[PDB]
Structures are given as structure tokens and as C-alpha cells.
Amino acid sequence: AVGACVLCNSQTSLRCGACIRRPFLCCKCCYDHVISTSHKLVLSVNPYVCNAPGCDVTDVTQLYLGGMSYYCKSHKPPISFPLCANGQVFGLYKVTDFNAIATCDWTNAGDYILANTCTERLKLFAAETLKATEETFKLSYGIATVREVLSDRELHLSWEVGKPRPPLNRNYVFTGYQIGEYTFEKDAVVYRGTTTYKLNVGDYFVLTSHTVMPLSAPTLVPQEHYVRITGLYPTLNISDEFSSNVANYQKVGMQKYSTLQGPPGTGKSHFAIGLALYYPSARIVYTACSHAAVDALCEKALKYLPIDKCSRIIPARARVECFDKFKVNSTLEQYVFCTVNALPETTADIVVFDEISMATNYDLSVVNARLRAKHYVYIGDPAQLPAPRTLLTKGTLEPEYFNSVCRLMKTIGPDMFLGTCRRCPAEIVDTVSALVYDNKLKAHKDKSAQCFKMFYKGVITHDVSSAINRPQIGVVREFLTRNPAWRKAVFISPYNSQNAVASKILGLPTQTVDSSQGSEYDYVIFTQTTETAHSCNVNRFNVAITRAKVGILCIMSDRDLYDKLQFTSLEI
Ligand SMILES: O=C(c1c(F)cccc1F)N1CCCC1
Numbered sequence: 001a002v003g004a005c006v007l008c009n010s011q012t013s014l015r016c017g018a019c020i021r022r023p024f025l026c027c028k029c030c031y032d033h034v035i036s037t038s039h040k041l042v043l044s045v046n047p048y049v050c051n052a053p054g055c056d057v058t059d060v061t062q063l064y065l066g067g068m069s070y071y072c073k074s075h076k077p078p079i080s081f082p083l084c085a086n087g088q089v090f091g092l093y094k095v096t097d098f099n100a101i102a103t104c105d106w107t108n109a110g111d112y113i114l115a116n117t118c119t120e121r122l123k124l125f126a127a128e129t130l131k132a133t134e135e136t137f138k139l140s141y142g143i144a145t146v147r148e149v150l151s152d153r154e155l156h157l158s159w160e161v162g163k164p165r166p167p168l169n170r171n172y173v174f175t176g177y178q179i180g181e182y183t184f185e186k187d188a189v190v191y192r193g194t195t196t197y198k199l200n201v202g203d204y205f206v207l208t209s210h211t212v213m214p215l216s217a218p219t220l221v222p223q224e225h226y227v228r229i230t231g232l233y234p235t236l237n238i239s240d241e242f243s244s245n246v247a248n249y250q251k252v253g254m255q256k257y258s259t260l261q262g263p264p265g266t267g268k269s270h271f272a273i274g275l276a277l278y279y280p281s282a283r284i285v286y287t288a289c290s291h292a293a294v295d296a297l298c299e300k301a302l303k304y305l306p307i308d309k310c311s312r313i314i315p316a317r318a319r320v321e322c323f324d325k326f327k328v329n330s331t332l333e334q335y336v337f338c339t340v341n342a343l344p345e346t347t348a349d350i351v352v353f354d355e356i357s358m359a360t361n362y363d364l365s366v367v368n369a370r371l372r373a374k375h376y377v378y379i380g381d382p383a384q385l386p387a388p389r390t391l392l393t394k395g396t397l398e399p400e401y402f403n404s405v406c407r408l409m410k411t412i413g414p415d416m417f418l419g420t421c422r423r424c425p426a427e428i429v430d431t432v433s434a435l436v437y438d439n440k441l442k443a444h445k446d447k448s449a450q451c452f453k454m455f456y457k458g459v460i461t462h463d464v465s466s467a468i469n470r471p472q473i474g475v476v477r478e479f480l481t482r483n484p485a486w487r488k489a490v491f492i493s494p495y496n497s498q499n500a501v502a503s504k505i506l507g508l509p510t511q512t513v514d515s516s517q518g519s520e521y522d523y524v525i526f527t528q529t530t531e532t533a534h535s536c537n538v539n540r541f542n543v544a545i546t547r548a549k550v551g552i553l554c555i556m557s558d559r560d561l562y563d564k565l566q567f568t569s570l571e572i
């Protein structure tokens, strides 16, 4: 009931009852809120309400203190003070940006912009508020009751009338009823049970809204610069493999936190694991939002670090198949590999947070909450894809607003930049270097002469809102008969519905751009499918074409992105 003010930390009794988080506001700040917003309910030990029987006045602006009790204009005794006076709300121990965060629906980009340009305590308020709002939106969607079970990977669904139907991608993970988590793909719908169960007809699925805990720790701890490497002990015997990263590794030990911008295939995993070999006695917690990113760091560790000193931390509510080659759930091992949501309460000499473009400010805070560390390293690329903002439908979120780390990387620049792409044919490196990396990304590989582009708008059909371009899949089919080396190629598009069609016609393994991020394939076929802001997003485009080691075919809808591709153009 008595806590600290989210804007000035000033001790107070006052909480906003109208805010969904109910933040402590100090007399001077609580006023500026309630006088400028539809937010009028204030809480103390007891609510600021008229205490007269049957009186429904709760608006703090229309209330008075009569003794130790509160009354409206109609019930106040002659000797009474207005609760709102001289820029204050009467409480014990006697902001434009707070108001916008407190009252926005989170459907506008500008909401996310403000949640990242504001002060540090307002980043936490925003991050809880947003996440709270995201969770209570899941309740808006209708229940899926099973009408008929066709097979072990297909069934038919009956949807709740009067409630919208959630996108049936892999993004939207349902909870079945507790028959385990389930996902769906597009009357024949494809079902995938994290726990395998003889699917019972009549059983139902619901999206698991998880309670949003409060944030305490900042997104980013305060920066500390040191004169010598602090708390870490370097080798003099670091293998030439990692000699390229020694100067950056010393920067890591002479700062509290450091930022690494690593474009695709520039040696991020190599950097992260090489840090353990440079500071060989240091305890390092390796974290990322997704299981795939933490498992990617496990593969690299398996190759270079002693397997006995590694532990993969798996939450007992296991949702996807996870890295198996380490001892599982040994929190005390020198090397700990854990998703942000599973992190234990522990300490560490270095924390490495990977895939930083995918992190929210909520995730940045949780990490700082669960891990007390001498050094924090943030690895990723603001030119790659951010975490999906399910509520955002109006305006595009720029990379400087993805989170606090990406905002630093886009304004004052990253502390360290890996500038040489060792994965991609020069045609792809040249294209993305000019598009998102200000001509600072360099190609280690030669031109493959296997990078082709074709301008072909085709015809755009929709499965609800997910896009399909059959003629673009048709052009790929034609190309494959003539280019049989591409039979091994991964098919990539910005839409699962296009991928679903391309899976039946082509038989290629299928991937969305967003699910492709962090993976590489010798050959990539990309159909842009549509000209929308989704399919023309330069970050998504960057990730799409930088998956390829040897060749790429890009069937394009957007003239701009087609022209920019420094690829050999095809006809038809
Ligand atoms: O100009 C740079 C840069 C660099 F070239 C070296 C170090 C830090 C930097 F921000 N970049 C633009 C986007 C990709 C990196």
C-alpha cells in the first residue's frame, strides 16, 4: 500500500487505480496524471471514494478530506480540504510521457517509440503495461472445440461464435484441455501436439494467458567504464581461431555492459564462445529469448568448451525438443545455457545475451533481475528481425525502438562490429551492405554467380490474411526442372500460407523469413509473395537473402527491392 513513485521514486501512499499495473504515484506526479487523463481513481490504504453511504463519486478531483475520511462536494463537512489542491493529491510524505504510456492501447508504433525514448523507470512501467495488455487481449479470441479427428497430424475445428479467430501460424501456441501445448497450420487443418495425445473429439484448445510479473531491474544497468580488465583473468594461450576477437574481448572486461552488432555470418556464436576461452576461469551464463538461439550457442560450445562444465537449463514444462548433449538443469556448471523465461536466480562473471533484436524491454529487465554479473554482453543485429508485437497494427516499428540495446546500437552505435560476412556469396553481402549496414559489411566469399532475381508479381490469393502467390510458386517449379542443383533448396517466404502451398507443389523444406533467422542453407528460394509493408520490410528482406551460403533465387513483387538486388536477372 506504501511504495515508491514510478516517475521520481518519492515515497508515497498513492497508487493509480485506473492504470492496469496500479503504479505508486507521488502527490505532485499523481495530480499531473489525474488532471490530464481519464484516470481519476486513486488508491491509498483505502480507495479515494466518497465515504457517505450509497454515494458513487470516485473521481479524486471531485473529492475532499473531512477529518480522516473522504467525501464529494455533496457530502463534505464545512471543514474539509480538496484532495486535488496546489498541483498535488493529498497523500502521505507530501509526466506527459507517463500519461501516454498509461492510457495507450499499444496498437500504434508511437506507443512503442515512447516506451523506448522515455526514462528508465518508465521503460519498466511501459514494458509491464504492454505485456499486461498483450495477455488480456489473448482472452478476446474464441475457443477451438474439435469436431472430427481425421489423422495423427490433421483434424477439423469448431470455432466459438461472436469471438475473433487467432492467426493459425506457429506464432500462436494453444493450450489443450491439460493435454499439453498444441499448434495449427492451414477445411483440413494441421495439428502439432508438444505432448503426443490420441486427439479426443469434443476436447478444446485455449491460448495460455500468463500473469505478467512486475519488473524491478533496469533494461540496462548503468554503464561502468574501467581502466583495467575487471574481475576477469585472460589467457596468453588463446588459439589463432579467436585472435581476431582479442581486442573486443578486452573491451568486454573494461566495461559493465557491451553491445556487439554482428550482421549475418560475421562470427557472433564464434565471438560468444571465444569469450569463454579468452577468460577461461570465468563463469558465463549464455541466454536468448528462444530455445533455438540458446541451442545454437550450445552447438558452438560443444565444439570448443569442455562438455562437463556445460549445462542446458530446461523448464520442467518442456514445450519444444531441446539441446540434449549437456547435463540438464545443473545451475552451478561454469557454462549455463538457458532461455530468458527459464533463467535461475544466480550470479556470473559474464552474461552473454544473444539475438538481441528479438528481445523486448521486458526480457532485458528480467535478465538484469535474475543474473547479478560483473559483465553483460548484448549480441545481435538491429538490421535483423524484432519480436512480433501482436497488438501493433498501425505504423512500422523502426530498429532504434526494438529495445534499449538496439536503441543504443542505432544512435551511439555498437561497442563492437563484426564487419566480414563469411557465409554469403558476395552478391548477397553487397546487397544487404548497401541496404541496412551503410556499406560497412564486407564479403569474405567471391560472387557465387548462383544469385538470381526475377520480377514476377503473379496473383495474390489469401488464406484469411496470410498471402499466397501460386504463379510465383509456378515460376519456381519451372526454374527447378532447369536447375536441378536447387532440388536441395529451402523455400522461404514472408507467409506460412505461401509456404504451405509451396510445400505441396515443390516438396522443398519450407521456412518463413522470421523462422529462418539464425539458420543457413546452401540454396534458398524466396518468393516475396506480396507488396505489403510486411514483405518489403528491409529487416525481413535482409534476413531472407542472408540465409544462403551458395545460391539464392528471389521471385520479387517490389520494384525497389528487386532493382537493389545485385543478382543476375532471369526472364519469363
Ligand atoms: O558504421 C557502422 C559501424 C562500423 F562500421 C564500425 C563500428 C560501429 C559501427 F556502428 N555501422 C553502420 C551499421 C553497421 C555498422
Ligand SMILES: [Zn+2]
Pocket (backbone or CB within 6 Å): 016, 017, 018, 019, 033, 039, 102
Ligand atoms: Zn492511471
Ligand SMILES: [Zn+2]
Pocket (backbone or CB within 6 Å): 005, 006, 007, 008, 009, 010, 025, 026, 027, 028, 029, 030
Ligand atoms: Zn512522483
Ligand SMILES: [Zn+2]
Pocket (backbone or CB within 6 Å): 050, 051, 052, 055, 056, 057, 071, 072, 073, 074, 075
Ligand atoms: Zn458523496
